[PDB]
Model the fold of this input.
Amino acid sequence: FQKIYSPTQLANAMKLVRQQNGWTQSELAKKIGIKQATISNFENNPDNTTLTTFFKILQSLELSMTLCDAK
Amino acid sequence: FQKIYSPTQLANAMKLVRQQNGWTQSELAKKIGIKQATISNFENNPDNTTLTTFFKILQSLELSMTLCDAK
Amino acid sequence: PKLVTWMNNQRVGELTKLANGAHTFKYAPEWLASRYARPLSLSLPLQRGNITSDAVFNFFDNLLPDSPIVRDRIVKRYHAKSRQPFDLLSEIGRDSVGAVTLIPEDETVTHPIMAWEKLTEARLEEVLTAYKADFRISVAGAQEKTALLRIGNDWCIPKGITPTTHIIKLPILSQSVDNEYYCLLLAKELGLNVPDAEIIKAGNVRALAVERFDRRWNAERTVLLRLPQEDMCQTFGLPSSVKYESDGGPGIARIMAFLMGSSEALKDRYDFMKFQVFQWLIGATQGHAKNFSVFIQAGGSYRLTPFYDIISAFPVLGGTGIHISDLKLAMGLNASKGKKTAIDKIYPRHFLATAKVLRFPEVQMHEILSDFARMIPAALDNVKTSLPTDFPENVVTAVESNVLRLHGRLSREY
Amino acid sequence: PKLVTWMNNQRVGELTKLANGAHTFKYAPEWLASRYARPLSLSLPLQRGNITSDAVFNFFDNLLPDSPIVRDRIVKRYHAKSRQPFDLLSEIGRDSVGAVTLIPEDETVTHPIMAWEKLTEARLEEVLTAYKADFRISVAGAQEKTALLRIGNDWCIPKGITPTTHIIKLPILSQSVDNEYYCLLLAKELGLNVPDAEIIKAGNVRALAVERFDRRWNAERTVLLRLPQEDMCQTFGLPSSVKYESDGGPGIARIMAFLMGSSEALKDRYDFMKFQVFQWLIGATQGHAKNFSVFIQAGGSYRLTPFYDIISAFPVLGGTGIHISDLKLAMGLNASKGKKTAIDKIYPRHFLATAKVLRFPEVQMHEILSDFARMIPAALDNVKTSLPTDFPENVVTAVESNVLRLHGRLSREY
DNA sequence: ACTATCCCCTTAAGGGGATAG
DNA sequence: ACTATCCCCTTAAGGGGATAG
Done:
């Protein structure tokens, strides 16, 4: 798939997936036990976002991640 | 490749790669502009680690990440 | 002499016991690169050097029985050089729980991969009754239990590194075998993920036969595969001496947070909490860390394994000192005043209070309680109309009776 | 009428100008799922709805020339309904910088994909001299410039949505064409990533022909492809009115941090800083945000593009008011007292001070200065012995002379 | 040599709780 | 309906700087 190199490229991607799946920041946040504000921060200011936060949101999107070379 | 679902699975993986490539926390930290302590924290306590930090370390390992389904 | 650690005939690494008696482990470079590569235990993440932390010792120690008395029974049988984990494991290291096969460095001695001895109804009666007063297995847990290989229609004993398919439990509780056989049937009836168990009758002895979920035949049906796994003591690198939360073991929060990193995180978290309620309803008080396990998958992924070792402490009341007010859940719930654990004092508001702090969807905690509220009744019936003709009705009634007592606390709200 | 945005004959989306005059953009669902999918601009991340933020307006506005006077020259030529970005783009929206092709909604009018008119040495002399007193292109930048298609051995003019291969610049600075032709040759000689440019002579006019790095022929050689890209004003969703840092544009820190997210991050960061030094050595003061670009790759990846639009302000000293002490770098460096930008006051310790705050490897800043210290001399020579027989020696000497003056500041330490 | 800590200090994540557009 | 903010409050990331094992 597409290789990602920054917090921003990440959030843009994840936010696209949430929109393509019709989910709101609220339903996902309830499922994973975090505040809706947290999801919002993540989408607009991913730089200083925690990794557990990131993985909880990754789980709520029914997604996963993988490492690879940057060629 | 192997799907990752948490900060810890992530750090274990990334730390393996650093060791398999013979790098130290110091040489990588200098290259990406962060403190060696930061790399150490990341390897042992990835939960509350920033995403930029995570991507800077990802770049220093000559790696990249990608999203995917968890099946 | 180093202990070579194998996992389905794949060299993972070696266990070393230094002169100073320090246990160390080192992953085999070939394993670090293997397709099947994964840590032996999450407490021992894949890395290059010699691992020297206590997790190494604790991990392997957790493969052997808890009772220091039982270990003696092992040093006795297979003449061990000590009750030390390493020395013992050098004797019965073959069929250990999970999927590790510890074989001494100096001992290729290619053991039969698929071999077994079709036991007679007498030999079985001998082996069963045996555990009370080639067979190199290792079952860890709270009580006394062995393990057999079921093939065709005969209970056979493995020979070599051949795996077993069933964990067999013997009567200790006066009918622990019947207590668990019931708790399991009921667990299934309520949609909880549990192993199908059966009761084997050999002459006079009565034993429980649980199908193992850490065993699977390959596609060809030519090889019985061991699925890697570890309990919550291992996962956290803790000594079995702290398996209970009151002693220092992990609780709901610890486990729940860890489950967030599961491949099936949202489902496992739901299932784990659901089970906290089931344990309450059937007065099960053995829900300690070594009773929950995760499967270790290629790359380091894990997901919760089926629940097992379930027994109700209900049949042990009245006639003796033991009373419903003396039953406490191994893992506490959140209460207004600190934490609660007394079954007979526990109420829905407690599970909801716990969910509140853990931040587990409130709506799902409501749905869990709700589902039980309306399913217990029908569940007991189907289970009951399943109990063999010769099943101790005092077990059925004691369990069934107290379940409804607690259940009422639910239906009264849901 | 909406403007359909194409990218190499692939529908990316549409630009809409509402009644209230609000510019909006909406990605085409088909594009969001495309293999080639990527945002038009990092300031406009792929999403489902109508994008209404100012980044939409600023992005497209940044495709047109900076000078409000020039835009008039456009409204004049292709009779535009306004100097408004949308109206103008509806006229010359075909060959815009980067790789977008804006064609009105009501206008499939399949335009020739590969078409051109082999110009004569006279027609060329006409078009060149023209820009001073089918051709629907759009070159953005600081000065007046057009763009042609080079094929075989003839300068041809594109016809339709056919791409161009060269950015042609005309003499404004009295010999801007020669100033840049030199700065580029020198840049290459020093290992900096820059486009190969040449000087085209048509009758009396003398023009610069820069090969475009945002253009590439497909494997078949049957199609000229536009490579997506954007400058630093666009990347950050800023108006060209703030392209300089002193006005409000991005500086070293901003750019450097952003480069950390490059596919070639470590190399790009090194290259960007290296260029900050080169700009210093050749007294280039045009290093504003719209002079740095990143290529946009499938999925949203980006990497720094080659440097371009390089001119030395050295040839403009002495004889006039302008003096070396009046030359300031567009992007400031870190100084003891705030920040420094005066070329003639800048010293190695400044680049090292900047590197210190940005946390760019100190050792690499040392190696950059070091490499220049010992390479400039040889570099000037090879470049010089390359300058065509008819090259203004006042340009060569003015540049060469002042380079050594600053260079000495280096060799003196490295 | 390499990694884990440790003090100082500023900035801010994220949970509570809750509302303006 | 959905997302961005906002106040309060505790915890700690990560840069400086630097050392114990």
Remarks:
- The CA atoms of residues 11 and 43 of chain A lie 5 Å apart.
- Chain A touches chain C at residues 30-34, 52, 55-56, 59-60, 64 (CB under 8 Å).
